[PDB]
Design an enzyme around this catalytic site. Structure first.
Site, mmCIF file in Angstrom:
data_model
loop_
_atom_site.group_PDB
_atom_site.id
_atom_site.type_symbol
_atom_site.label_atom_id
_atom_site.label_comp_id
_atom_site.label_asym_id
_atom_site.label_seq_id
_atom_site.Cartn_x
_atom_site.Cartn_y
_atom_site.Cartn_z
ATOM 1 C CG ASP A 1 35.801 10.791 8.347
ATOM 2 O OD1 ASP A 1 36.782 11.481 8.677
ATOM 3 O OD2 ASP A 1 35.075 11.079 7.364
ATOM 4 C CG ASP B 1 28.249 8.936 8.475
ATOM 5 O OD1 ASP B 1 28.766 7.863 8.798
ATOM 6 O OD2 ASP B 1 28.525 9.490 7.385
ATOM 7 C CB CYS C 1 7.948 18.374 9.105
ATOM 8 S SG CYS C 1 9.592 18.892 9.652
ATOM 9 C CB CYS D 1 11.647 21.379 11.182
ATOM 10 S SG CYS D 1 11.486 22.159 9.537
ATOM 11 C CB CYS E 1 7.491 22.445 8.362
ATOM 12 S SG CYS E 1 8.230 21.462 7.016
ATOM 13 C CG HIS F 1 12.351 19.969 5.696
ATOM 14 N ND1 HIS F 1 11.246 19.806 6.507
ATOM 15 C CD2 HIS F 1 12.350 18.932 4.830
ATOM 16 C CE1 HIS F 1 10.569 18.743 6.102
ATOM 17 N NE2 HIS F 1 11.212 18.203 5.081
HETATM 18 ZN ZN LIG Z 1 10.124 20.607 8.197
#
Ligand SMILES: [Zn+2]
Ligand SMILES: Nc1nc2[nH]cc(CN[C@H]3C=C[C@H](O)[C@@H]3O)c2c(=O)[nH]1
Ligand SMILES: Nc1nc2[nH]cc(CN[C@H]3C=C[C@H](O)[C@@H]3O)c2c(=O)[nH]1
Ligand SMILES: [Zn+2]
Lengths: 358, 358
Positions: B92, B255, B293, B295, B298, B324
């Site tokens: 930025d 963002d 999810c 990830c 999880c 997460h």
């Molecule tokens: Zn997750």
């Protein structure tokens, strides 16, 4: 694997290297056990802890019973499942943190029976007997009184552990030697513990204010009083040089919050001694924390970067420092084990001290 | 790969999906860019950021110029090398944080020329023009004045960027549209930016206090004013539902500190809406944060465990929540990209909203 088996593969003087076999895995000794305070090894995933070389971690009974609670953890499947570490876990008895009557301590209540019960609820692999810890300094009379009470409590711990079939069949129980700095009291304690019989023996009541000289002095006479064929655990020790000296005196197992705690503080251990990464001299230093360390942090990040993170208060600073320090401790234990196996530990200790304190 | 190439693979209404090709890698659009405030994406190693699916991250010019300093970072090899992220980084301009005269802002000094210079020193891949950000609410007159000044500064940014051979040949420059909520001012700004010519165009000056309705209203007329064949970047946005609506209106890049920031706060994003993991209802919940999810958090840890860590103030709580939330955002962008490619984004948006706000 058996419930518990300790085998000594090699010796050099009082030093020993070998393995403890347990249901959840093998522990290479001498061992360093990272401390998990609130069901986490601070700032590290369990996979990262394992990747540093740790075979076993320590859980704190006092903290866990308060939050999230021992019964809740049991209901959730036990500590291993809860925190995602499937290898052995040793739990302390809560005796040190809680520091009264012959029955136990109130503060919540803690007794030999409740401590054993909590450690059962957590699903601990190595259970510590509940003891009374003698403050330093202590008169001969007060140390005898505490030691005597701890031996009575050791018996109570033994009986409580044995009364639970699932626990007795799957976990191990360690007794704790007390007696302050007095040879006679240490002897009586060791005799009492051996009469009861335990899977391992801890030297308790050290690193509580006495210097290294005095600690080493007490270790000199105290460790040979313990059964030779069982693991010897020096609780709450310690600095790298403390560890080397304690192994030279027959200790097989160690734990300390130092590498995690001092990590977050900015202290990084190196073969040339500790450095504080916050020091301005590191602000543009492109070298890794340690030029020989094989850890992931040292492979990727500079002193300059970590200096910046720690000064900025960034969580990644804590993560990287803690990983490094724990990996350093495991590398130290590996070098100790190898040198004992090769009959050159005496030389290693000397070379280690010369460089670390140069 | 080329210095900069944006190609649109598929469209559905105003929505587009495609790729930006740059020297350091490919960016799949619509894209979400995790924010690195002080040369770190809070509580995550760069490898973990990448593993969640991020193609590019955002660095903050204002913070980095203060600590550790732009010149120091250059001396240490640039931001990529410093923090260990080798893929594209967008920086930025510092315009929002620093929020004066026609030359720039003093507070340290910041001008179009210094901002461009700092971003060069960091080694940024996508450089943002230095703008003046109109507070909300703003009168037509004050918004015109700021917009006019920002366009003059956009020209100055363009010329400063172009005057540096290494920068012009290897990085891209985005201009920023201003004009508050006024269609005419937005039009003049878009016309001015296109006359200058940029690699991409950001819609600036939104998410500064106006509601979602008003933001969507401004997006409705503002995005079609921008060149169709270049990326459209909505700065500082935002919540999952903001993202879906902005893509429906032609935005390609996003963002926000939200997923990192609210992660540490205890807020976890799920397909059924956000939950606060600190809530007592999760104290014994063995389910993962989100049942769908994919990830790593999880796959391994329960709501009950994370609840405990966040309540205990443990660093691992921040680590797991942030991983997460960032992974959730990337999964959201993946589903958006796939649905646009398959011409079913309209249906996805509807299904997404029905469940998220059920
Ligand atoms: Zn997750
Ligand atoms: N139960 C118990 N826990 C302990 N932690 C640390 C020490 C001594 N250092 C100790 C002890 O002597 N007993
Ligand atoms: N330079 C600049 N940076 C920015 N960050 C966030 C916003 C608006 N939200 C913005 C802007 O309008 N200009
Ligand atoms: Zn290292």
């Amino acid at each position: 694997r058996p419930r518990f088996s300790f085998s000594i593969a090699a010796r050099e003087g009082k030093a020993r290297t070998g393995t403890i076999e347990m249901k959840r895995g093998v522990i290479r000794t001498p061992a360093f056990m990272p401390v998990g305070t609130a069901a986490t090894v601070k700032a590290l995933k369990p996979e990262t802890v394992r990747a540093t070389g740790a075979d076993i971690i320590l859980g704190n009974t006092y903290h866990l019973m308060l939050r999230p609670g021992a019964e809740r953890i049991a209901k959730l499947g036990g500590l291993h499942s809860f925190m995602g570490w499937d290898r052995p876990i040793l739990t302390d008895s809560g005796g040190f943190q809680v520091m009264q009557s012959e029955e136990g301590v109130t503060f919540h209540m803690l007794s030999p029976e409740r401590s054993i019960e909590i450690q059962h609820l957590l699903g601990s692999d190595i259970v510590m007997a509940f003891d009374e810890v003698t403050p330093y300094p202590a008169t001969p009379s007060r140390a005898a009184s505490s030691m005597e009470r701890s031996m009575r409590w050791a018996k109570r711990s033994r009986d409580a552990f044995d009364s639970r079939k699932e626990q007795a069949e799957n976990a191990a129980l360690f007794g704790i030697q007390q007696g302050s700095v007095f040879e006679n009291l240490r002897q009586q304690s060791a005799d009492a513990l051996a009469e009861i019989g335990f899977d391992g023996y801890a030297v308790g009541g050290l690193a509580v204010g006495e210097g290294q000289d005095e600690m080493f002095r007490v270790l000199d006479f105290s460790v040979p009083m313990l059964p030779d064929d069982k693991p010897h655990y020096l609780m709450g020790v310690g600095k790298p040089d403390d560890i080397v000296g304690a192994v030279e005196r027959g200790i097989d197992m160690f734990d300390c919050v130092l590498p995690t705690r001092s990590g977050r503080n900015g202290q990084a251990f190196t073969w040339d001694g500790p450095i504080n990464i916050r020091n301005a001299r590191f602000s543009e230093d492109l070298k890794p924390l340690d030029s020989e360390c094989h850890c992931a942090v040292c492979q990727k990040w500079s002193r300059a970067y970590i200096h910046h993170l720690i000064r900025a208060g960034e969580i990644l600073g804590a993560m990287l420092m803690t990983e490094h320090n724990i990996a350093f401790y495991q590398q130290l234990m590996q070098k100790i084990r190898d040198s004992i196996s090769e009959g050159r530990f005496s030389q290693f200790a000397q070379d280690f001290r010369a460089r670390y304190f140069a």
